Structure formats: structure tokens, C-alpha cells
Amino acid sequence: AKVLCVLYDDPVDGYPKTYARDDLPKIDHYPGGQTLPTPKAIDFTPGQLLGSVSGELGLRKYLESNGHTLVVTSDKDGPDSVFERELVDADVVISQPFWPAYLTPERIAKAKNLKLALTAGIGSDHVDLQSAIDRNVTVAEVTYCNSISVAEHVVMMILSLVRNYLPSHEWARKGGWNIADCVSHAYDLEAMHVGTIAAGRIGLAVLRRLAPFDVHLHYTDRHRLPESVEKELNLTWHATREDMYPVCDVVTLNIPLHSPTEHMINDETLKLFKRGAYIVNTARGKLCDRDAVARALESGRLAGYAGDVWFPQPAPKDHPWRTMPYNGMTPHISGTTLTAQARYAAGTREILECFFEGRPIRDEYLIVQGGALA
Amino acid sequence: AKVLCVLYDDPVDGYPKTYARDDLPKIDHYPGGQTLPTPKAIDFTPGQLLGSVSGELGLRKYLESNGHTLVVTSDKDGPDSVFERELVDADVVISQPFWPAYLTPERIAKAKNLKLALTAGIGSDHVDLQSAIDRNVTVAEVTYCNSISVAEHVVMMILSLVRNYLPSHEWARKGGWNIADCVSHAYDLEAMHVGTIAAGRIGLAVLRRLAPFDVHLHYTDRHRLPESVEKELNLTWHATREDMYPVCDVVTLNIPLHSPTEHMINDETLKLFKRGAYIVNTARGKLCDRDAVARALESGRLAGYAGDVWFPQPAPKDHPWRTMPYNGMTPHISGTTLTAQARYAAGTREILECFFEGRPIRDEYLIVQGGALAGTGAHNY
Numbered sequence: 087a088k089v090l091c092v093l094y095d096d097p098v099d100g101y102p103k104t105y106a107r108d109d110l111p112k113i114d115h116y117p118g119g120q121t122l123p124t125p126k127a128i129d130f131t132p133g134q135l136l137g138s139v140s141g142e143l144g145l146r147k148y149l150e151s152n153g154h155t156l157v158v159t160s161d162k163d164g165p166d167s168v169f170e171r172e173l174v175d176a177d178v179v180i181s182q183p184f185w186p187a188y189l190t191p192e193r194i195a196k197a198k199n200l201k202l203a204l205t206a207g208i209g210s211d212h213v214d215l216q217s218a219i220d221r222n223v224t225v226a227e228v229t230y231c232n233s234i235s236v237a238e239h240v241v242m243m244i245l246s247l248v249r250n251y252l253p254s255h256e257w258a259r260k261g262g263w264n265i266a267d268c269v270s271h272a273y274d275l276e277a278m279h280v281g282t283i284a285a286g287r288i289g290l291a292v293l294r295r296l297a298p299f300d301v302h303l304h305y306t307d308r309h310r311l312p313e314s315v316e317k318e319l320n321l322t323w324h325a326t327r328e329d330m331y332p333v334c335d336v337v338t339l340n341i342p343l344h345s346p347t348e349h350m351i352n353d354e355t356l357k358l359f360k361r362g363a364y365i366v367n368t369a370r371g372k373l374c375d376r377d378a379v380a381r382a383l384e385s386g387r388l389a390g391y392a393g394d395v396w397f398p399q400p401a402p403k404d405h406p407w408r409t410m411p412y413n414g415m416t417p418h419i420s421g422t423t424l425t426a427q428a429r430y431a432a433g434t435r436e437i438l439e440c441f442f443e444g445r446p447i448r449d450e451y452l453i454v455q456g457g458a459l460a
Numbered sequence: 461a462k463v464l465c466v467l468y469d470d471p472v473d474g475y476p477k478t479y480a481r482d483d484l485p486k487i488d489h490y491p492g493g494q495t496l497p498t499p500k501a502i503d504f505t506p507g508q509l510l511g512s513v514s515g516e517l518g519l520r521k522y523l524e525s526n527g528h529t530l531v532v533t534s535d536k537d538g539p540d541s542v543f544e545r546e547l548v549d550a551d552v553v554i555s556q557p558f559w560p561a562y563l564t565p566e567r568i569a570k571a572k573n574l575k576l577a578l579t580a581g582i583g584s585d586h587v588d589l590q591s592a593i594d595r596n597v598t599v600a601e602v603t604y605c606n607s608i609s610v611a612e613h614v615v616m617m618i619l620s621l622v623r624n625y626l627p628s629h630e631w632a633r634k635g636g637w638n639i640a641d642c643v644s645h646a647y648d649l650e651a652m653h654v655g656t657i658a659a660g661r662i663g664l665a666v667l668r669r670l671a672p673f674d675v676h677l678h679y680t681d682r683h684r685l686p687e688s689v690e691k692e693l694n695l696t697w698h699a700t701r702e703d704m705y706p707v708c709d710v711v712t713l714n715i716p717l718h719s720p721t722e723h724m725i726n727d728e729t730l731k732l733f734k735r736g737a738y739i740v741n742t743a744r745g746k747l748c749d750r751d752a753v754a755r756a757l758e759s760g761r762l763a764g765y766a767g768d769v770w771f772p773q774p775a776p777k778d779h780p781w782r783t784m785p786y787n788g789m790t791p792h793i794s795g796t797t798l799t800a801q802a803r804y805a806a807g808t809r810e811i812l813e814c815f816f817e818g819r820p821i822r823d824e825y826l827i828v829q830g831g832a833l834a835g836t837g838a839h840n841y
């Protein structure tokens with residue numbers, strides 16, 4: 087079979103020959119009991135760069151030694167991409183949400199052999215699910231592989247915005263000192279009201295890490311949490327997002343982007359936020375109207391915004407979120423630490439092994455199978 | 461009476477006209493039950509810049525309306541400084557560890573009227589305690605006022621080093637994307653081994669904040685914690701510092717600086733750390749030999765270093781920690797957030813009210829009183 091795998095580019099200084107550390111922490115299962123991926127074997131050392139073209143998700147020897155072909159590229163955009171001209175006879179397509187190969191209806195129609203669309207990561211918003219359903223394409227993902235990774239990124243960004251870390255580091259880096267310039271915008275997180283707009287895998291992991299900071303925890307969600315979970319984390323439940331905003335010092339978005347959530351944060355809904363609120367958004371860029379956020383920071387209504395997701399992605403060189411006041415942005419990376427890569431590269435192999443051997447792919451990995459949602 | 465107060469400079473654009481928010485979160489007590497400062501009144505709005513010269517810790521109206529003198533300056537260094545010239549007849553001296561007015565024996569000898577030496581913050585190492593004891597000068601500080609503030613700074617810094625935040629944010633600010641360049645040095649914190657070199661007010665609050673990150677917690681200290689605290693946080697105790705380093709992915713320094721602790725992190729003790737360890741040091745700059753750390757980061761021995769404390773301070777413009785690879789430095793600020801200033805300004809006023817009204821200063825505030833090491837001060841020995 088032919089496996090077409092889209093990964094991001096190597097470092098500009100070349101694929102790393104050495105790494106900062108020798109191994110990764112041992113982890114057995116995710117919160118809730120789902121075990122980490124269980125492939126038959128791996129041909130990589132956990133901790134190597136696996137999500138770039140030269141890393142190949144550690145798949146090449148496994149695939150080729152079983153008679154399959156592996157084509158790896160980073161050129162995925164538009165009809166002229168290597169991805170598209172290679173797609174037409176691909177049996178399996180793999181990409182990561184941080185550098186996604188979109189499977190539009192038109193593209194899936196060109197893909198005459200497509201049997202499996204695998205997300206090396208979490209979240210197949212880049213795949214048209216109806217087209218997969220109609221064409222009996224299996225859609226799978228490495229569930230839970232980077233939920234904790236994002237949750238760490240979120241709490242890191244909350245602390246950094248509230249305490250004014252990034253400007254302070256600039257003062258130290260450029261040779262200054264300037265205590266008052268650092269702290270005239272710096273507060274403690276302790277006892278602030280913090281709310282998350284969803285409490286799924288990421289949101290719940292965020293809430294748990296926030297708890298010993300002695301913040302007041304709020305959340306909303308389409309499905310309310312177990313009362314025992316509300317009890318153990320002292321959660322205040324809000325029926326709607328708009329009920330939650332005005333009482334929160336910090337709001338983190340961990341909700342999916344779909345029709346009722348597009349531009350949910352805009353010029354009108356920002357008027358409901360307390361003066362000096364902070365917003366962290368590792369979910370999707372379009373949850374927030376790009377310029378309303380920038381205006382809110384320029385006018386001093388928000389005291390900070392931080393996240394790793396943008397619209398569009400990759401962000402153009404002039405994207406305003408890069409330079410607006412009190413931003414804590416990174417490129418789209420929170421779910422592709424080396425640690426997370428080791429998990430979903432192992433999960434990618436595990437799923438391929440199952441698919442080729444006819445064994446059932448774990449239920450939790452499945453998004454579409456046998457012509458319907460699964 | 462005459463109150464002499466040393467504060468740091470106002471911001472470059474002047475004293476702030478507005479702030480990001482209108483108020484501060486309501487807090488009742490510190491961990492352990494000690495209540496927040498309780499002055500009879502405050503002449504400031506919590507959240508204002510109070511630790512700079514124009515902020516005057518919000519003391520002028522209280523002092524002047526009671527017949528007192530308030531002199532506020534930033535010139536603290538040397539015998540011709542404003543501080544030393546005004547010292548000779550000052551009844552009370554106030555300064556912050558962030559810009560501390562040293563009370564050497566010679567200076568305390570010149571301070572003919574000195575009755576109370578107040579630290580607006582935590583850490584009176586700038587006051588010669590023996591000279592204070594001999595001269596029956598009361599030495600006090602606003603205990604616990606910024607312990608949590610520093611603990612937050614630490615976990616923020618641990619996360620930022622481990623996840624490679626600062627380089628990644630640079631890629632975003634400068635117009636790049638460069639995913640592989642961001643994450644070739646980025647890991648998750650989860651399940652790493654993290655240890656603190658002391659488990660006092662900051663060190664224990666750091667431990668509690670790290671727990672739900674599912675790290676494996678280690679610590680050392682001169683006096684171990686209650687076994688019940690060890691149990692509820694799953695702590696691994698180490699009898700010595702040198703035993704703890706080799707098993708930790710992250711080590712945070714939360715120990716005081718004195719002679720047995722000076723340059724405890726050096727070329728020789730760094731050889732005990734795992735390759736790619738991280739160090740966070742919000743404690744004191746001279747806990748680390750400056751160039752040993754700088755060497756350890758060029759060689760990849762450490763994978764990141766971050767803190768807000770330096771030696772000397774203020775750090776000279778060319779200080780290598782400012783620019784060395786994988787550093788997360790800030791200036792010395794973690795304990796002087798606007799939130800922390802509000803508490804220590806209120807505590808300062810509370811102490812002055814006690815001192816002037818003849819009522820006793822809280823025992824937990826006392827370091828030296830009545831000619832002997834006292835209160836919190838006697839507790840540290």
C-alpha cells in the first residue's frame with residue numbers, strides 16, 4: 087500500500103543530530119485510565135524530532151519492510167502541492183493538525199485509493215467527515231496524545247500574562263533593569279477568578295493544575311461535569327458562556343470551533359469582560375475575531391492575550407497578533423512537544439499496524455469507520 | 461518623628477496614570493493561617509505602584525498628618541548618598557529588598573536616632589542584626605507578603621523553560637513560524653522529577669502548585685516537613701543537596717544565601733545534575749557561580765536556567781545570564797508585583813501604627829526587638 091505522510095519542515099539549521107536530554111519521563115496512562123499507545127514495536131527513541139519531514143514519524147522502516155511505500159513531504163497547500171499530485175493513488179494519508187493536509191470533498195474525490203485518513207495528533211477538522219462517510223474512508227486520531235501538553239501550555243501562558251513575564255524578560259535580555267517598568271503591569275494569579283469555556287480533556291486538565299494556585303474556578307460546557315468533580319475542584323458552573331465572562335479575571339478557551347463558536351469573542355461580546363481580563367486561546371484562532379482582540383488590547387480593555395492558534399495558519403508575516411500590546415503568542419506548537427510527538431508517532435504506528443493486519447483499531451481512536459461516525 | 465524611605469525608580473514614561481484593572485482579589489490569610497496585614501486604614505487603592513519613589517508606599521498623608529517627616533529617595537549607595545545624609549537623625553528606616561538601603565554597623569552607628577528598621581518585603585540581610593541588637597533598634601519585615609508571588613514566578617518559569625516558551629514567542633514576534641525550531645527543545649513537564657532545595661514558605665507553595673502537574677516531587681531542607689505533608693504531596697526526602705540533584709529533571713532553589721550556601725551551584729556540583737536538567741532560582745543570585753551556570757548552558761549540561769535574582773545586583777548590562785542560551789531571566793521583580801506591594805505597603809503602615817501608638821508589633825513581623833533576636837528572627841536562629 088502507498089502511505090502519503092505530510093509533516094512540517096526540519097529546523098532551518100537542519101535536522102538535529104543531538105538533543106537536550108537522553109530520554110522522556112515514563113508515563114503509563116492518561117487521566118481516566120486510557121493507556122498510552124501500544125504498537126507492536128517502535129523504530130525511534132522517544133524524544134527524537136518525529137513530526138518534521140526528516141523524522142517521518144518513525145515509520146519508514148516499518149512500512150517498507152512490509153512492502154508499503156512512504157512518501158513524505160511538507161508541500162501540502164493548493165492543487166499544485168506535492169501532496170495533491172501524490173494523493174490520487176494514496177491508500178493512507180497522514181498529517182498533523184500543526185501542519186495539516188486538508189482532505190476537502192474535491193480532494194477526497196481525486197483520491198481513488200483512499201482507505202485511511204490518519205491524524206497524527208488530535209482533531210480532524212482538516213478532513214471532510216461526510217465525504218469520508220460516503221466513501222467508506224476510516225478516519226482515526228491518536229486520542230489524548232497531547233491533551234496534557236496543551237493544558238501545560240495554557241497554565242504557562244496564564245501565569246506569564248498575569249505576571250507580565252514576556253516584557254520583563256525583554257528588559258533583562260536587552261540589558262535593562264527597570265523594576266517599575268516590569269511590575270506596573272504585573273499581578274499575582276492567586277485568588278483571581280478563572281474560567282474555561284469547555285471542560286473536556288484539555289479544560290479539565292487545566293482546571294486541576296490551576297486549583298492549588300487558589301484561584302476561583304468557573305466553567306461552562308454543553309454537558310455539565312459530575313457533581314463529584316465539581317465538588318473536588320470547587321467549580322462554579324455557568325449555563326452559558328456569556329454568563330461566565332463578566333465574573334472572570336481570566337478566561338481560557340478549550341472549546342471546539344464550529345458554527346456557534348466562530349467569532350464568539352468579538353467587539354460586542356468583549357464588552358462583557360471585566361476591565362483588565364486575560365484571554366488564553368489554545369483552541370482555534372477563529373474563536374476570536376482577530377481585530378477585536380487587537381483593539382481590546384490597544385485600548386486597554388484586555389490586559390493580555392496569549393495562545394498558539396491563529397487565523398489563518400500559518401500566520402502571515404504581518405498578522406496583528408504578533409505585535410499587539412501584551413500578547414504571549416507562540417506559533418502552533420503546544421501539542422507537538424517532543425514528548426507529545428513520541429506518543430502520537432507510536433499511536434500512528436499502532437493504528438497502521440491494526441489497519442494493515444485487519445485487527446480493530448481502538449474504539450477511542452476512531453472518528454469515522456464503516457460509513458458512519460464511530 | 462522622621463521616617464526615611466528608600467524606593468526604586470518610577471517607570472521610564474513616568475508614574476502611571478492608569479492601571480490594567482480596578483482592584484485586587486480578596487484574600488483572607490496566608491497558607492498556615494497568618495492573616496494578611498491589618499492597618500487601621502490605608503491611604504491608597506490596592507493595585508497602585510507603591511514601591512517606586514512616587515508611590516511612597518502610600519505613607520505621606522498618614523505620617524505628615526500626624527506630625528511626622530517623610531523623606532523618600534532612591535539614592536541609597538555610598539556615604540554621600542541622600543540616604544546616608546538623612547540617616548543621622550531618622551527615627552525609622554524603610555526599604556525593600558528590591559532596592560535595599562543597607563544598615564551597616566558604621567551606618568547604624570551614624571544613625572543617632574534610629575529606633576525601627578522596617579523591611580517593606582521579606583529579607584533583612586541588608587540590616588546588620590548584631591548592631592541592631594546592641595543599639596536596641598527594632599528590626600521588622602512584612603512576613604509572607606510575597607511568598608506566593610515568588611512561588612507563582614517559579615512554576616511559570618519551570619513551565620517556560622521546559623516547554624521552550626521564550627524562543628517560541630520570539631519566533632512569533634519576529635514574523636516566523638518555524639515549528640520544528642520551536643519544538644526541537646520543547647518537552648512536557650508531566651512526570652518529570654522536580655525538586656526544591658528548601659521547603660519553606662516559597663518552596664512548599666511551589667511544591668503544592670507542582671502537584672497536579674503529575675511530576676514526581678523531591679525536596680531537601682535543614683528540617684524535614686511533617687510526615688503528613690510528605691504523605692499528602694508524595695514527597696521524596698533527600699538528606700543532602702548533592703543527593704537530590706542527580707535524580708531531578710528540574711531543581712528550584714528556595715534556600716537563603718549565607719556562607720554555607722554561597723556558590724552551592726558550581727562547576728563541581730553541576731557535574732551531579734542530569735544532562736539537560738533545568739534550574740530555577742528566585743532565591744539569591746550568588747547561590748550560583750555565575751560562570752559555572754553560563755558554562756553549563758553553552759555545553760548543554762543544563763537545558764535551561766531562569767530566575768529573577770543576580771550577582772551583582774542590579775546586573776551589569778553585559779551580565780552573561782541576560783543572553784546565554786536557553787535562559788528565562790527577568791530583573792529582580794517576582795516579589796514586587798502590584799499585588800505584593802499592596803500587602804507590604806499595608807503591612808508597613810500597620811507596623812508604623814503599632815510603633816507610634818505604643819501597641820506591640822505582631823510577633824511574626826519581628827526579627828529583632830528589645831535587644832535580642834526576636835519573633836520570626838529568633839525562629840530562623
Ligand SMILES: NC(=O)c1ccc[n+]([C@H]2O[C@@H](COP(=O)(O)OP(=O)(O)OC[C@@H]3O[C@H](n4ccc(N)nc4=O)[C@H](O)[C@@H]3O)[C@@H](O)[C@H]2O)c1
Nearest residue numbers: 208284285286287288307308309340341342368369420421
Ligand atoms: N495544539 C493545540 O492548540 C491543540 C492541541 C490538541 C487539541 N486541540 C483541540 O482540542 C479541542 C478542545 O480541547 P479538547 O479537550 O481536546 O476537546 P474535547 O476533549 O473533545 O472536549 C471539549 C468539549 O467542549 C465541547 N463543546 C462543544 C461545542 C459547544 N458548543 N460547547 C461545548 O462545550 C464538549 O462539551 C466537550 O467538553 C480544540 O478546541 C482544540 O483545543 C488543540
Ligand SMILES: NC(=O)c1ccc[n+]([C@H]2O[C@@H](COP(=O)(O)OP(=O)(O)OC[C@@H]3O[C@H](n4ccc(N)nc4=O)[C@H](O)[C@@H]3O)[C@@H](O)[C@H]2O)c1
Nearest residue numbers: 658659660661662663681682683714715716742743794795
Ligand atoms: N523576589 C525574590 O526573588 C524573593 C522574594 C522574597 C523572598 N525571597 C527569598 O525567599 C528566600 C527563600 O525563602 P522563603 O521561602 O522566603 O522562606 P523561608 O524562611 O526562607 O524557608 C526556607 C528555609 O530553608 C532553610 N534552610 C536554610 C539554610 C540552610 N543552610 N538550609 C536550609 O534548608 C530552612 O530550613 C527553611 O525551611 C530567599 O532565599 C529568597 O528566595 C526571594
